[PDB]
Amino acid sequence: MRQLLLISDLDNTWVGDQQALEHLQEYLGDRRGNFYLAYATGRSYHSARELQKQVGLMEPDYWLTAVGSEIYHPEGLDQHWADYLSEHWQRDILQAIADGFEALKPQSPLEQNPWKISYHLDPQACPTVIDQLTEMLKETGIPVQVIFSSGKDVDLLPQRSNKGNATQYLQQHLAMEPSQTLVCGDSGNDIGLFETSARGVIVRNAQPELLHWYDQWGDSRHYRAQSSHAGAILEAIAHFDFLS
Numbered sequence: 001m002r003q004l005l006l007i008s009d010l011d012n013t014w015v016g017d018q019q020a021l022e023h024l025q026e027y028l029g030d031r032r033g034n035f036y037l038a039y040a041t042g043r044s045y046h047s048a049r050e051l052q053k054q055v056g057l058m059e060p061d062y063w064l065t066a067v068g069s070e071i072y073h074p075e076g077l078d079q080h081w082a083d084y085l086s087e088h089w090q091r092d093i094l095q096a097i098a099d100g101f102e103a104l105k106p107q108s109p110l111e112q113n114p115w116k117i118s119y120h121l122d123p124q125a126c127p128t129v130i131d132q133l134t135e136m137l138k139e140t141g142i143p144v145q146v147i148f149s150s151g152k153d154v155d156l157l158p159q160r161s162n163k164g165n166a167t168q169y170l171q172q173h174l175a176m177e178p179s180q181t182l183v184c185g186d187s188g189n190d191i192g193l194f195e196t197s198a199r200g201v202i203v204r205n206a207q208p209e210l211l212h213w214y215d216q217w218g219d220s221r222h223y224r225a226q227s228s229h230a231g232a233i234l235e236a237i238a239h240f241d242f243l244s
């Protein structure tokens with residue numbers, strides 16, 4: 001029932017340039033009832049809440065955390081989403097396989113959840129290892145997808161997950177059209193966002209893998225902003241003529 005569904009990553013997207021974050025929130029703060037806001041972050045819910053206190057993030061309507069593996073409504077965790085993601089998912093088998101790659105080191109326990117297995121790729125290792133990992137995991141027949149970003153972060157998620165799928169679920173939940181949706185990102189864990197039919201903005205300070213993705217799959221609905229961080233969001237809103 002609103003004119004815009006705004007979905008944005010936090011680190012290096014909404015966050016990173018405090019001045020830009022502040023004028024973006026001031027602008028949005030004057031028409032809060034005109035849009036639904038959702039933060040689609042790689043961070044856990046707790047970590048995202050902590051970031052909110054650190055930089056003064058405005059309260060979103062929804063939180064799509066841990067790369068969309070968990071969705072929080074104003075009322076709490078979305079149990080339907082969790083069950084949907086649990087179907088056919090085999091965390092232990094996938095973990096056993098990933099744990100076997102010497103170039104991969106587990107990320108801290110607090111970065112893990114039932115539907116998210118994360119690692120850090122050795123800076124000295126060849127990125128090609130990610131391709132080998134992906135193929136090996138896929139061949140298990142378990143519906144899994146590999147998210148590689150910033151040249152170091154590796155996330156194993158159910159195929160039904162990732163920011164894009166979480167976004168489409170939210171769109172359906174809110175009866176919001178892709179044409180009324182704007183997704184904002186900066187890295188590989190945002191590619192799922194641009195795979196959707198929503199309008200999208202890639203921040204100027206975007207990571208190499210996202211820029212590479214844009215050069216190959218970039219369409220008319222995708223916008224390469226001149227501004228970095230939060231400034232790219234205001235720029236995109238004007239570009240797509242949202243909140244007319």
Ligand SMILES: OC[C@H]1O[C@@H](O[C@H]2[C@H](O)[C@@H](O)[C@@H](O)O[C@@H]2CO)[C@H](O)[C@@H](O)[C@@H]1O
Binds near residue numbers: 043154189
């Ligand atoms: O999906 C990629 C990784 O994202 C991580 O979010 C963080 C991190 O927690 C922050 O401290 C800051 O550095 O930005 C990162 C990128 O957004 C998440 O914690 C990892 O588990 C993910 O693999």
Ligand SMILES: [Mg+2]
Binds near residue numbers: 009188189
């Ligand atoms: Mg990102």
